[PDB]
Amino acid sequence: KPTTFMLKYDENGTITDAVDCSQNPLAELKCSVKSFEIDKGIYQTSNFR
Amino acid sequence: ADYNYKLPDDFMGCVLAWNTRNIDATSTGNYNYKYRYLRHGKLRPFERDISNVPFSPDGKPCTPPALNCYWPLNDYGFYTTTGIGYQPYRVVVLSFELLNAPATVCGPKLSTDLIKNQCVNFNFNGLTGTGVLTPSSKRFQPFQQFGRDVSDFTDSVRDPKTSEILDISPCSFGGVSVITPGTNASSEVAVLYQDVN
Amino acid sequence: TQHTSSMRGVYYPDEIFRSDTLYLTQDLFLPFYSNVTGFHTNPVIPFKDGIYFAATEKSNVVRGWVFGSTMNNKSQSVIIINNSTNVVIRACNFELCDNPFFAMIFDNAFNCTFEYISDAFKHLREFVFKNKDGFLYVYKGYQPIDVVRDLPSGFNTLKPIFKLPLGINITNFRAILTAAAAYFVGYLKPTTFMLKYDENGTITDAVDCSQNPLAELKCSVKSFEIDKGIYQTSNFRVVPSGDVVRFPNITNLCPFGEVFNATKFPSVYAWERKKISNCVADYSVLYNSTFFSTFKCYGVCATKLNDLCFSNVYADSFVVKGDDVRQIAPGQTGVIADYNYKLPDDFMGCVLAWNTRNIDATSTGNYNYKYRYLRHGKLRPFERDISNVPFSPDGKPCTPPALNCYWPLNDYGFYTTTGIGYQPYRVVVLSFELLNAPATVCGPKLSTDLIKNQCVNFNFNGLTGTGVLTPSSKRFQPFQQFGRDVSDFTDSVRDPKTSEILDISPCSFGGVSVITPGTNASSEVAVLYQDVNCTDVSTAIHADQLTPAWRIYSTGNNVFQTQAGCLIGAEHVDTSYECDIPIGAGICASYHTQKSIVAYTMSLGADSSIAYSNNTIAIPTNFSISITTEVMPVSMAKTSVDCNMYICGDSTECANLLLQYGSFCTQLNRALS
Amino acid sequence: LSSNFGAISSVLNDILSRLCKVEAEVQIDRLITGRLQSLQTYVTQQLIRAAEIRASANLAATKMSECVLGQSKRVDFCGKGYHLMSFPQAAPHGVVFL
Amino acid sequence: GIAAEQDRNTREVFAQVKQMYKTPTLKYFGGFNFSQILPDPLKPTKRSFIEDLLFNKVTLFMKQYGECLRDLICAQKFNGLTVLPPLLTDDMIAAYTAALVSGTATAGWTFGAGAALQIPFAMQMAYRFNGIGVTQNVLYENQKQIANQFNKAISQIQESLTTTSTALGKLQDVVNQNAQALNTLVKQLSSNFGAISSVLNDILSRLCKVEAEVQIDRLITGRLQSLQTYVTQQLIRAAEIRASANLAATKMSECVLGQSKRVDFCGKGYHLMSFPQAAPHGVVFL
Amino acid sequence: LSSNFGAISSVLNDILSRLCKVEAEVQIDRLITGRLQSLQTYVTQQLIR
Ligand SMILES: C=CC1=C(C)/C(=C/c2[nH]c(/C=C3N=C(/C=C4\NC(=O)C(C)=C4C=C)C(C)=C\3CCC(=O)O)c(CCC(=O)O)c2C)NC1=O
Ligand SMILES: CCCCC/C=C\C/C=C\CCCCCCCC(=O)O
Ligand SMILES: CCCCC/C=C\C/C=C\CCCCCCCC(=O)O
Ligand SMILES: *[C@@H]1O[C@H](CO)[C@@H](O)[C@H](O)[C@H]1NC(C)=O
Ligand SMILES: *[C@@H]1O[C@H](CO)[C@@H](O)[C@H](O)[C@H]1NC(C)=O
Ligand SMILES: *[C@@H]1O[C@H](CO)[C@@H](O)[C@H](O)[C@H]1NC(C)=O
Ligand SMILES: *[C@@H]1O[C@H](CO)[C@@H](O)[C@H](O)[C@H]1NC(C)=O
């Protein structure tokens, strides 16, 4: 299906991890800030669709 | 383009032309088609001039067979045995408007029954979009088909089959927040929805 | 027989439903409080880009119109008529009688083009007629007035009823009457208006932005009710006076028959260049003789070649075959574009080509034309190579008849009985510069005498604009024509007929401020001009071109010279008050009393005097307890935005195009959070 | 949001309904840049207004510290006269000192 | 909004007093010579001597259509950029400062909080000495010395102002910054921003309509960005000026209208008095 | 510096390598305006900080 993904490359150019940006709100947050690490708090994500 | 037929700069239409030598050209010549080559100015777009007054380089009228007084029309002479630059062509120019007015010439696309109170993809007279359709209390003049709000978004439509007015609303609404501890602490989150009870 | 159009003649501009909005537009409108001409109980009234026609009657005397150009047999005309129980629209060649009456109005009709019949059928009937792009637009409205002897005041919106595809040269018109009534005629002008819609979609009130400073302010802030104060406003006033066209005086027709009707052209590898100078490029004279299969211009619209003058005109001539004409273009590859003739990437000029099979082709075969198909590199733009050294794939010279040694030129073989891709074509390439150098090849435009010290529209060798022409003290080199400012705005030009230097300046200068109380309080305003004396406002604002209601606000008795400008429309007093509307430089204004706007010098405070002494002291004997309030802001509203809903909405195509600008919204979210 | 920024219209649906891909993308990018510029202008004005509000709130905090929780000898810091006391009251988005 | 804030700044700094006290006829109070910071009737101008020097230290619009027809101001005005006059004339600000100095010299500190009360100047100076930690007699057995030192320090201030130097440098910085910003707007008008030229007239004189809106829209967006950048820089500079004006207002309320115990708020040392003088777009405290 | 701002690529080299003089100028102008806007936004935020 047409889907947006965020992919991680290691030191040898090999894809080791990914985030599916439409699975749950936490992954939407991860794709929005472009990181695999989210700090503690409350974040405004995109509106309900 | 100067003396016979002009198009506007902003045209919105289609030009079609095809070769018609087997019909409009005869062996001995066909002199029934004419064009104007003398005029005191240029034409405006979509303007016609069918007069045949004799022409003078100054504005004063004159008798035809005298000096400096010409006939402004000139003959295409079409023969069967000439090059393709001198062969006759038939031209049809089609002019129309799009997505602004009531429309009576449509494409071969098939229709579907209405759906109320649900986010759907709609195609109203060629106007595509995605939203929720609801009955309206707005009153449309007979020369109006669409309606716009303060931000020029098409919000009202008249049904082309059963002529009723409908509002279109977006189907995304309300703000969402995610409450989390650190990612290294846990992967569990809480979701807060404003604007819902 | 002269009356006023008191805020009438407004129509629906579109077919889009709008409710509870202010919509500001610009079109052909009848100006508010403008002149209309009344006709009471019929000549050929001239037509000028639309009219407003109003009919007041009680026995239905006006029954239609005739539109056309000459009112003669020799042009097409349209009649719109209302015979009893029909409405007839007809566009034909009419032998129009001198007196058309009983709705008899023509003698004979022939060459009929348009025809329309409607279905079978104390008052004010209003129509707007406008001619545009081969369509005649007719707008209609109606009011039940009781009695009048003029055009009554009011407001009414006209609806579109007709859009007729006639294509007629309409420059005159005449009404058609039966045999007491009145009809009034007004003229439309290009004007900016603002319109107010109801909750039902009806246009109920409008603002014209050229009659008063007040309405200019109202549509300057896009509102109908204005608060109390002073506001800076725009320049919705000035129209240019006239036209000045200056061109070099050249009388020679330009050598079209020498360039196009030549006896022979060269080969494409030995193409020839000619200079064109001191001529008038009237290419209309080719409209009976020479016809071009290719004509393409680069850097300039083809419809403006008659309005320009050209600096350095050169003509290149050669002969190719039919398939190679597509290679005469700025970016191309092929044998001609690589080894024979190349155009620059930023070429400005025109390419012309025509078929020459009756001259350059023989039944035996013409072998006089050549082209180079072997070279060690590519030609530069406008470079030529007419050598005939034998070619080798390596760089060494070689003897002709040996191995791997070829002759670099090849023959075009032109027969009468071949396809059109193998038929000869004559090509002429014209190259020039525009609007930066002295010029001597102009178009056929006619000149006009100079008008100085006035805001006009000018045309100096193709350079158009609007400004004020004054003599200058500069000195130009012989190779210079124009002069530029620090903002690269053309301010100097040498007159091509009488070689003198002129200075071009804008005709708008200074600011205008409007001092007003509330719109609910009154409709009277005062106007402040900052950077002029009002000994000298008449020259500065061009007061002569304005409406009469604007000339009462430029000279008068209530003028007053302040240090911030001078003020017109307020009464000066010698009593000082603490002020509410600050004009500036110590001057303030207010709405005091017969209410009027007054202007005074503001008061610094009360006057006092304390008697200094070296041996007396003042001591308080009693006291009071006072409580004073103080209000301070602490926070404002916290807000958040979503880029995807704001920019794209619900579209997935825009949402996919927004992945490029992904870092430009996380930054905004970080700032707002 | 009803500006077209030099495109054929301000509605994305009307651009997508009658133009094909290259021309439509050329028209759409103008609207994207214009709307993103409008958002940037809004955020910049919000930042400047927040700086002014923060200065006002710092002054209100030091006023409540030095005038409600003590007696100040600074001239005209709290009232017009010789300061005796002060009382705070809450206001919408602000504070009032008596 | 910025233009209204400037007048609000000037009013909240200088319009502190509710009464306009007359300048006394005598300018000699107990040996203290006040004639260099008060207006005099013999001099044709209305301001003071030190204010005259201050207004001559900082260097700095009467153009009309007949006046200029390569001036930078007329080039600004022809392109739609204008400068508005301040609401308060410099003579009104000089009147305000003269009222403040007269109230300090005649009524002391009491006119800031309530009505003014007359007091001889030597007793006021003894009260100022008492609020520092020095006793009341130290003024009275050393009055002529203190008066002579006051007069000598005033003369030193006058000499150091009348010699050429780089004092009053930040007011000059302010006027330089404003002039530079307006000149940058005028010179930014000769960029083509991705069009074929920067002139509208020649790109209308030789192009078809549809391409002409493309080039015109490129020029329009470029010039609109230029104006937006100018307005943003003006708002930031206005915020800085407003902070400075608030500090000036509290300094005048706490140092001209009273005696301050805050260290180094008003001068270096133990504060006795302060006097305000007007400067172009600013104030000077002695 | 990797956005293309409505051009065909964000690299100046590969659009000078295969496009042609005035088309190349048309794309490079869009890239220039985008990067100037980035620098403007950075300087404005630095002034406020
Ligand atoms: C001249 C061209 C012409 C036009 C443009 C036209 C339009 C027109 N006239 C109408 C009615 C009408 N038309 C007329 C008569 C006239 N109307 C006129 O424009 C003129 C000049 C006369 C006089 C000869 C009358 C009396 C009505 C009845 C309106 C009523 O009482 O409701 C109507 C129907 C409106 C309605 O009944 O609600 C239209 C559309 N009729 C015409 O003849
Ligand atoms: C005399 C040699 C040419 C000199 C022309 C000088 C300047 C160029 C000005 C106009 C170019 C017109 C070229 C002919 C256009 C033919 C149009 C047509 O029929 O389709
Ligand atoms: C036969 C397959 C060749 C594959 C070449 C691949 C890429 C190169 C693209 C174009 C060059 C060859 C095409 C022929 C062009 C003819 C040019 C001319 O003579 O006017
Ligand atoms: C990368 O490759 C090197 C050598 O091949 C290896 O030592 C190292 O473990 C690899 N690292 C990863 C993350 O694959
Ligand atoms: C066809 O269109 C007409 C409107 O002209 C409408 O009245 C009618 O109901 C339509 N037919 C059907 C089957 O819906
Ligand atoms: C949610 O619904 C309940 C049910 O009546 C109601 O009592 C409550 O007030 C609603 N919440 C809000 C915020 O209005
Ligand atoms: C308009 O008509 C009036 C008649 O009252 C006349 O005085 C005035 O000159 C006319 N306007 C013009 C521009 O001629």
Ligand SMILES: *[C@@H]1O[C@H](CO)[C@@H](O)[C@H](O)[C@H]1NC(C)=O
């Ligand atoms: C047109 O009218 C004129 C005027 O009488 C007449 O002389 C002429 O013959 C008419 N032409 C035709 C074609 O009827």
Ligand SMILES: *[C@@H]1O[C@H](CO)[C@@H](O)[C@H](O)[C@H]1NC(C)=O
């Ligand atoms: C116009 O009206 C008259 C009288 O009412 C009628 O005889 C005539 O037929 C009408 N015209 C047309 C074209 O029907």
Ligand SMILES: *[C@@H]1O[C@H](CO)[C@@H](O)[C@H](O)[C@H]1NC(C)=O
């Ligand atoms: C106009 O009428 C004349 C007859 O007088 C005819 O010869 C000519 O062809 C007509 N023109 C058109 C365009 O029909």
Ligand SMILES: *[C@@H]1O[C@H](CO)[C@@H](O)[C@H](O)[C@H]1NC(C)=O
């Ligand atoms: C026809 O229209 C042209 C402009 O398109 C105008 O110059 C000419 O004068 C008109 N004809 C007559 C007879 O007036």
Ligand SMILES: *[C@@H]1O[C@H](CO)[C@@H](O)[C@H](O)[C@H]1NC(C)=O
């Ligand atoms: C809209 O139309 C209704 C229909 O009767 C009318 O009652 C109402 O007054 C109209 N709206 C306005 C603003 O007049």
Ligand SMILES: *[C@@H]1O[C@H](CO)[C@@H](O)[C@H](O)[C@H]1NC(C)=O
């Ligand atoms: C001009 O062209 C015509 C067209 O064939 C030709 O007959 C004539 O000889 C040419 N004139 C000259 C001087 O070459």
Ligand SMILES: *[C@@H]1O[C@H](CO)[C@@H](O)[C@H](O)[C@H]1NC(C)=O
């Ligand atoms: C155009 O060419 C024809 C061909 O014979 C000629 O009769 C006519 O006079 C020419 N036109 C002019 C204006 O000379």
Ligand SMILES: *[C@@H]1O[C@H](CO)[C@@H](O)[C@H](O)[C@H]1NC(C)=O
């Ligand atoms: C023609 O131009 C020349 C400039 O070379 C000028 O001296 C002369 O006056 C002009 N002719 C007329 C009639 O003005």
Ligand SMILES: *[C@@H]1O[C@H](CO)[C@@H](O)[C@H](O)[C@H]1NC(C)=O
């Ligand atoms: C003055 O003092 C007397 C008693 O000392 C008091 O009654 C009176 O109210 C005071 N004056 C005022 C205005 O309060």
Ligand SMILES: *[C@@H]1O[C@H](CO)[C@@H](O)[C@H](O)[C@H]1NC(C)=O
């Ligand atoms: C006060 O100082 C001025 C300036 O030095 C001087 O002219 C004047 O005489 C002094 N006043 C007295 C009373 O000496």
Ligand SMILES: *[C@@H]1O[C@H](CO)[C@@H](O)[C@H](O)[C@H]1NC(C)=O
């Ligand atoms: C005109 O204005 C100039 C510049 O402000 C001034 O010097 C001059 O005195 C004024 N003249 C009159 C007559 O007002």
